[PDB]
Structure formats: C-alpha cells, structure tokens
C-alpha cells in the first residue's frame, strides 16, 4: 500500500543509495518492511543489522500474512557455527546480530561475494557503536558491488556537537543524504488532507503537587550546578536544567563520564546518583498516586538513615518542604484525618470516557459502536488506571492506603462522608483497551496495537512525539475511517516542558542537517587473537586496517595474543584504577604469568588530559597505600616478569602491536582458547548459590541436584541442611544467613 510521499522516498532510495533521516515516528518500520518485501527472494541474501526480536517477529508474521514463501530467517549465537553457513546459502532476508556478523566476516564463514546488499536499521548507532562500522568496512572490502541502504529516525542524534553527519555518512559508504522531516512539503501537504480530530485537555495540577515539583526542581538545579562546579570539563550546554528533565539525559551523562569514571572522585558519583534519584522522583510525582509517592519518599529516607545514600540533599531546607507537602497530600495530623487526594488527570480521563460513552450510546446505528484505546507510559500506570476505572477513586485510594499504611476504620468512614459532601460468544459491545506505550523499548508498538484493534477513539494519557506521528500516519493510511485522539497533558508541568523541548530539538536538528547537507554538496601474513568483548572499541578495527588479520575467540586469559608466548591486557587509566582497587588485576596477572612466558600490561593514557596517577594532597605527605602509584609499584614488584606498554591512543597501540611481532612466530586459536555441567546449571541462580556461605563447589554441586529451586531452599530447616550439605557448621551458617533481620 505505502503512501504518496513514502513512495517518492522509496523511489529515491531505489536510485543511488544513501541514508534516510525521517521525523520521529514517520513510519521508518514501514520503509524497512517495504524493502524486506522487495528482497524476500530466495535467489538473493541481504542482511538487516539493528532490529529487535519483537520487530523481527512482527515483520516475519506480517510477511507470512501477505502470503510470502521463503520468509526471513534470524541468525544468532545460539545456532552452531557450522550450521550458520547453511542459512547463509539459503538466501533471502537474514536478521543477524553485530557480534556473529563480525565473527563470520573475520573468519570468512560467509559468502561475502554472494551478499547482494545490507540494510542498516537505526543508522544513528553507527556514530558510537564501532562494531557496525567494522562490519561495513569488512563488507566493502570484499564485495564492492552490493548496496547499502540506511534508515533512521532520531534526527536529534546528529545534533550533538560531539558527532558530525559527514563522518557517519562516510562510515556507511553512501555519499547521498535524504532528509524527510515533518515540515517537508511532500509530507505536510499530504498529511493535511487526512488529519485526525485532535482535542486536548490541559489538566491543572494541584497546588500541593506544584510545591513538590518546585522543591524537586530546586534540588535538581542545585545538584546540577554543584556537578558542573566539580567538573569544569562538563560545563557543556548539554547539561542544562531543561535537558535534565528529558528522557535521554542519562545516556549523555554516561557518555560524558563512563570513560573516565574511576578518576572522577567521590562527590561526583554521589551527585550522579542524586540526579538519577531526583529524576525518578519527578517521574513518580507526575505519574503515580499520592500514597506511592509517600512510600518512595519515606523509603528514600530509610536507606539514608541506614547507609547515607542521599545525605547530601535529603536534609536540605527545600527537601523538608517536599516531605511536608507529600504528607499533607496523604495525611493530616491535628488520630489521622486522612485526606487521600487523587491527582486531577484521573478526573479528566473519567470525563473523556463519559463523553465517549455518550457518543457511542447516541450513534450506535451509524456503523458499529466503536472501540476506545488508552495509551499509558508504563505497566504501573496501566494497572493503576484499570483499578481506578473498575473500582472508583474512593475504593482504590482506600485499598492502597490500607495495603501500605496501618488499616483504620473509624478514621476511614469520616473521610468517606466528606468525599460525598455468556460463557462464549462475540462481545458486540464497546471495549476499552489499556496499552503500555513503552516508548524507549520499541516506540513502534502503538502501530501494531492500532492495526490489531481498530479504535474509533484514542486517549493519549501520556504523550510523546513518536506516538503523535504514529497516530497521524495511522489515520492517513485509512482515507475513509475517522478517529478522534484525546491529548491529556499536565498544564505547567515538566511533562509539557519535556514535550516542547523535544519538539524544538527535533526542528533545530533538522534545520542543522539541512544546512550541513547544503554545505557538503560540492565535495608474510600475520595474525592476532582478539577477545570477543574487545570489539566494542576501535583497536580491532585499526589492527585489521594495518594488513594483519584477526581471529576472534572468547579469551579467558588476556585480551590479545600477539605471539605464542605473549598476552596483552588492555586497560585505560580508569579501568586500571578500577582493577587495581577491586583486585581483578592481581588475579589477571597471576593467570597470565602462570600460562604465558611474556605477560604484558597495556595502559592507554590521554596526552590531551593527562592524569597525575597519584593521590591528590599526598604529593607532600607520606607514602599512601591507597594511592594508585603505590599499588602499581607493588604489583610490578610482585610480578617481575610483567612488562608494561604505555600508549597515548588506539592509533599508536596498533603501531606498537605491529612492531612487537617482527620475527616471532604467529599464534593460533584453540591453543589460547584451550588455556583456561557447562551446558547445565543455568548461570542465573548458579552464582547466587555459590555466593552464600556454606558452599564452595562440591557441597553446592551436590545439593542443587536434590533441591528443585532456591525458592523452596528457604523452606528447609537447619537439620535438613546438615543432612544434605554433609556438615553442621556450614549448614548452621547458611541457615543463619538466610533467616536474619537487618540488625
């Protein structure tokens, strides 16, 4: 079916290959499905890179619905390596993960000359994920004939100053860029002839709910300013107060702090924890009821007393205002004259549902009754909405209050008065369906629900840009059937601010992309064994570029094997500090020295921002054991055979690796791999079984056969533990561990 502007886009992409940036929610899955339907042939094989299992299953099922033989097949690590060559020879669309594709391309267990193309969904991941760049470099190194089409929503991902569209565009080997924003003439003119009957209600917050938000925002602003003060390099505009409200703030704070985490300090990590807690406090305030908010507030103070997690801001003069306001929301102490206030959004939802039911009970004869779909943010909100509708405000709030707090009857009845002051068959009646949006996991899940149940009315209890665009596209797909979308938003809150910031960020990102596109218009063999987890970095790509091939295996001893007697552990300054303090590096050195004749430790420092590697304030004090320099000296003193390589960048590390093997023989896999039941004994509960006291290897291995699960493990008494374990002391220790309070 497609559309008009969508078919123009498809024709343009069937022309000279390139990458397509659409507006958030403008049916990128539809374009991917169109290309999959095009390439479901058995005489060709294309690879789709970044897709979720749910999206892949939906695509396969829809293609089966259409009546297509030779459906797409999914290839994952579970399939045996020799069997993976079978599905490649079968042709057709192949859903593959980055890791197995890297392994297959490097080991040449894939007909790289038979690949007719590659489709890169979510092409904005090329910016930071070095695996896909390596896959595309390897593919272009062998085929040079197949196509590369890339699709992406999230035009904001190119708006950050760290990245550049030209670099990622060159990584994809495309050389042509297609921009399809929401204000594009072809799409805007077409979407104006099939617009939905949107009606939005601006629900006003309670004055008590406003004070809580004001206090939380004050605390968040203070913590952000403190974080900026301690990290002058973090003064970037990406950490403004209006950006901390948004969803993707955690990703930016990780990108700016994760590479140098262990050298950050003590207060900075606590400040990041406070930022996360304040953001989840904002979410709880805007989303859930009053009793749940009070529960989270009180539990937050409970752990501060026990450990002191939030001691920085929990005792602030503004924080006490939040506690008092929450208590006034739930309690009233003059004996508890409970208030149990409900947030206004439920009343707006009730009014909307009443109007919808009135319309249905007025116009049954004009077709069917019509179905209503309610979209909420997550599962908790959906459950709360269903309980509120089925029970009522009073019963629901009383149930929550009694379940959590102390159950009272004499005080409860006083509040009630003040508040007042068939087995089988087709339903053939209006149905209300509550659906969790889950925007972060897979935004294109609202489209599947919309196509599964065709709703005459949609209530957007929680709204994001992608869902608005999806509802706009869904209506235009049916030119005759109308729908009315209700847009419930909290007036003058952080939800409205977040939505408006998303709007303006997308618009400015698309304008910047347009300008960037305009400006750019005119322009013997040797091997190294590389650990699998090391491909999330640029070093394996730079090593391969120098002309030496890579054999990727799972290495339990070291990251690189340059020679038969050599082993390199790659540690940055942050990871070196973390491993020295943790104690992992000592065990790694022990194993490497035991197994390899020439163990090597590689440290990658930063010439631009060097780290002192010595404790601050100890420059003039005595030698401190907690210092990193002292720990490094101790380690090199206890391992005289260990050799250390210092490199300033991954580019220099590759050169050193190439030079370090000038005449030595090459290594081989299955020898470093074999350096070091397994199929049984699920890794999940195995570690939990191992870590509690009373079990080293033999007693635990014996006991897990007798006991079906750890669920009933707590049921056994001390004597049964003595009988099963074989000892009474360890059994007593385990029983005391499993049955003890917090004291």
């Amino acid at each position: 079916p497609l559309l008009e502007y969508e078919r123009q886009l498809v024709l343009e992409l069937l022309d000279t290959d390139g990458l397509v940036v659409c507006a958030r929610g403008l049916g990128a899955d539809r374009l991917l499905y169109h290309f999959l339907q095009l390439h479901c042939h058995p005489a060709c094989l294309v690879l789709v890179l970044n897709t979720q299992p749910a999206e892949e299953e939906y695509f396969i099922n829809q293609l089966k619905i259409e009546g297509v033989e030779h459906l797409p097949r999914r290839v994952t690590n579970e399939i045996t390596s020799n069997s993976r060559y079978e599905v490649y020879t079968q042709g057709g669309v192949i859903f593959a993960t980055s890791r197995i594709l890297v392994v297959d391309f490097l080991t040449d267990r894939i007909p790289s000359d038979l690949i007719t193309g590659i489709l890169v969904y979510r092409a904005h991941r090329i910016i930071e994920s070095c695996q896909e760049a390596f896959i595309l470099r390897l593919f272009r190194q062998k085929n040079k004939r197949g196509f590369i089409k890339a699709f992406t929503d999230n035009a904001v991902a190119f708006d950050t100053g760290f990245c550049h569209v030209e670099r990622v565009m060159r990584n994809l080997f495309v050389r042509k860029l297609y921009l399809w924003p929401r204000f594009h003439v072809a799409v805007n003119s077409f979407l104006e002839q099939h617009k939905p009957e949107v009606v939005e209600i601006h629900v006003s917050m309670t004055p008590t709910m406003l004070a809580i938000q004001t206090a939380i925002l004050d605390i968040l602003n203070a913590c952000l300013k403190e974080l900026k003060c301690h990290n002058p390099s973090l003064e970037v505009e990406d950490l403004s107060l209006e950006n901390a409200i948004g969803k993707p703030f955690d990703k930016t704070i990780r990108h700016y702090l994760d590479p140098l985490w262990h050298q950050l300090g003590a207060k900075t990590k606590s400040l990041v924890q406070d930022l996360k807690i304040l953001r989840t406090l904002l979410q709880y305030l805007s989303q859930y009821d009053c009793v749940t908010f009070l529960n989270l507030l009180e539990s937050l103070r409970a752990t501060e007393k026990a450990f002191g997690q939030n001691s920085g801001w929990l005792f602030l003069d503004s924080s006490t205002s939040m506690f008092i306001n929450a208590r006034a929301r739930v309690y009233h102490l003059p004996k508890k004259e409970l208030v149990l206030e409900s947030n206004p959004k439920w009343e707006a939802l009730t009014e909307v549902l009443k109007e919808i039911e009135a319309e249905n009970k007025e116009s049954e004869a004009l077709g069917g009754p019509g179905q209503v779909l309610i979209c909420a943010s997550d599962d908790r909100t959906c459950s709360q909405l269903r309980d509120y509708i089925t029970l009522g405000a009073e019963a629901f709030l009383l149930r929550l209050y009694r379940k959590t707090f102390e159950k009272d009857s004499k005080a409860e009845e006083v509040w009630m008065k003040f508040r007042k002051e068939a087995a089988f068959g087709i339903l053939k009646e209006p149905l209300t369906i509550i659906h969790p949006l889950l925007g972060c996991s897979d935004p294109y899940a609202l489209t599947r629900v919309l196509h599964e149940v065709e709703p005459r009315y949609v209530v957007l209890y929680d709204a994001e840009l992608t869902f608005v665009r999806q509802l706009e596209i869904y209506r235009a797909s049916r030119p005759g059937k109308p729908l009315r979308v209700y847009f419930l938003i909290y007036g003058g809150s952080t939800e409205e601010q977040r939505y408006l910031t998303a709007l303006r960020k997308e618009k400015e990102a698309f304008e910047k992309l347009i300008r960037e596109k305009a400006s750019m218009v005119v322009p013997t063999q040797q091997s190294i064994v590389v650990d699998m987890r090391e491909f999330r970095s640029e070093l394996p790509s730079l090593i391969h570029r120098r002309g030496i091939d890579i054999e990727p295996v799972t290495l339990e001893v070291g990251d690189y094997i340059l020679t038969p007697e050599m082993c390199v552990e790659r540690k940055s300054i942050s990871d070196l500090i973390g491993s020295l303090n943790n104690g992992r590096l000592y065990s790694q050195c022990i194993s490497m020295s035991r197994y390899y004749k020439r163990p090597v430790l590689l440290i990658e420092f930063d010439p631009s921002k060097p780290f002192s590697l010595t404790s601050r304030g100890a420059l003039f004090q005595e030698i401190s054991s907690n210092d990193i320099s002292s720990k490094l000296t101790l380690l090199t003193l206890h391992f005289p055979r260990l050799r250390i390589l210092w490199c300033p960048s991954p580019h220099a590390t590759a050169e050193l690796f190439e030079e370090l093997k000038q005449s030595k023989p090459q290594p081989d896999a299955a020898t470093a791999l074999a350096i070091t039941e397994s199929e049984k004994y699920n890794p999940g509960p195995q570690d939990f079984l191992l870590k509690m006291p009373g079990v080293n290897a033999k007693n635990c291995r014996s006991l897990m056969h007798h006991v079906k699960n750890i669920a009933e493990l707590a049921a056994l008494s001390q004597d049964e533990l003595t009988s099963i374990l074989g000892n009474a002391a360890n059994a007593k220790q385990l029983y005391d561990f499993i049955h003890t309070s917090f004291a």
């Binding site: 299953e57 149905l431 369906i433």
Partner: protein, 121 residues
C-alpha cells in the same frame, strides 16, 4: 463491514485479527456481511476453547508454555462460501481490557489470534 472484533471465552477475551482477502482485481470487502461474521466464531469455537484450556493448566504446571499451534501449523477449516486460516502468534504487549458498559474487568488472552478469509470457488 468487517472490523477486527473480539470474542469472549470464559475468563479471557481473545482479540481476533480478521483479514479479508481481496476479491479479485476489483476487491469488494463488502462481500463479508454481518451474517458472514456470525459463523466465524462458531466454526472456530472449539479452536479457541482448545487454545485457552491448555493455557490455564500450564500455569497450574508453573512452567512457561508454548502454543503448540503455530505459524508452521495453520488451521484450515472449511465453511459456507468462504475460507478460514488461523494461527496463534505471541503478542508481547500486556493489553488490559474493561467492559465499559458493565465496568467489569476482563483479561486479554496474551496470544494474538489472526484469521484470514477469502471467497470459496
């Protein structure tokens, strides 16, 4: 006409996914009248019942369950001038339903039910 309807079976409600195949080059979806909708459920009454029944005792078996009636094994039931082809696909979304007329809860069957019909020769 033909809209994706819902069928109740015990404590659950199954959200069927009706798909009318095109009627030749000049597709006429109006051939599926209101009457033609009524025998679809009774023809498939045992199919849904045999699919809900084993979904309950596997929970009583306290272990994860497969449909044992999947894409590779469709249901090809005949009829009266029309065809039927039905699978049972996992949905993956926790949908919740309430009968607004009675304000009574109703669980949604987690397995998506899809049936395709076409004019018989």
């Amino acid at each position: 006409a033909s809209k994706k309807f819902a069928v109740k079976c015990g404590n659950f409600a199954v959200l069927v996914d009706l798909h009318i195949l095109p009627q030749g080059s000049n597709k006429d979806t109006s051939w599926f009248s209101e009457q033609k909708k009524e025998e679809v459920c009774l023809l498939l009454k045992e199919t849904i019942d045999s699919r809900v029944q084993e979904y309950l005792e596997v929970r009583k078996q306290h272990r994860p369950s497969n449909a044992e009636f999947t894409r590779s094994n469709p249901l090809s039931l005949k009829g009266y001038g029309f065809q039927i082809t039905a699978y049972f696909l996992k949905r993956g979304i926790r949908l919740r339903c309430i009968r607004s007329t009675q304000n009574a809860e109703l669980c949604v069957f987690p397995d998506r039910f899809v049936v395709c019909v076409s004019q018989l020769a």
